[PDB]
Amino acid sequence: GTILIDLSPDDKEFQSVEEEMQSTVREHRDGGHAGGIFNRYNILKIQKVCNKKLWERYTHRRKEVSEENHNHANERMLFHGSPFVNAIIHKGFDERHAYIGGMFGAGIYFAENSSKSNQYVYGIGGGTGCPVHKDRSCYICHRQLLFCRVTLGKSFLQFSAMAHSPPGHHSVTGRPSVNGLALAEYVIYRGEQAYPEYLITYQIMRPE
């Protein structure tokens, strides 16, 4: 049921998604080990992910959460990187897309920093890097990330350096407590709480 609609680079929607991609790059504590060395991306394509059944699955859950939280879904747009991006856009998020070993338990993880999600494009820790060159810092190969609509509801705040949500909460927020430049990361424990709105195709760019 999924169709992908290309956005034009002239479209304000392309431009605002690109700006969120580019402006949320940061340096990582691994010096680029997992995701590569870069300060910015070459955006090759942005597509809207259109699936009526998956969208209705998301909105149904969003209303349930909203009604449990004084009519506030606490909806965000966040990045997701995964080797399973193709399955996700076709079948939706579910338990098979969870980070079993994540620091907030087995759930589906999202990031404010696009460069954080970029570390997972080729697997946990960047895996063995790109299929073609086995390079986690490949500047040639095309990568994909999702920019997703995510319902957080009442989020459990974890200060720090599938399972169930903590009782009385709908998500977990991983607040950065050491690296002053890191943005928040978030975990949901029901795949119905995220919709993969945009598929972004890009390369990381070698710094000059």
Per CB under 6 A, residues contacting ligand 27F are 79-82, 99, 109-111, 116-117, 120, 124, 185
CA distance 205 to 203: 6
Which listed range, 72-80, 133-141, 148-156, 195-203, lies at the site for Zn ion (CB under 5 A)? 133-141
Residue 17 Cα distances to 77, 139, 201, angstroms:
10, 21, 12
Which of 21, 46, 138, 188: binder of Zn ion (CB under 5 A)? 138
Closest approach of Zn ion to the CB of residue 126, in Å: 12
Amino acid at 4: L
Dihedral through CA 179, CA 185, CA 187, CA 191, nearest 10?
A: -160
Residue owning tokens 């090759």: 44
Single out the residue of 73, 130, 145, 172 in contact with Zn ion (rule: CB under 5 A): 130
Only one residue has tokens 């699955």, namely 57
Site for Zn ion contains 205 (CB under 5 A): no
Q: Residue positions in the annotated binding site?
A: 130, 133, 138, 141
Residues forming contacts to Zn ion in the complex (CB under 5 A) are: 130, 132-133, 138, 140-141
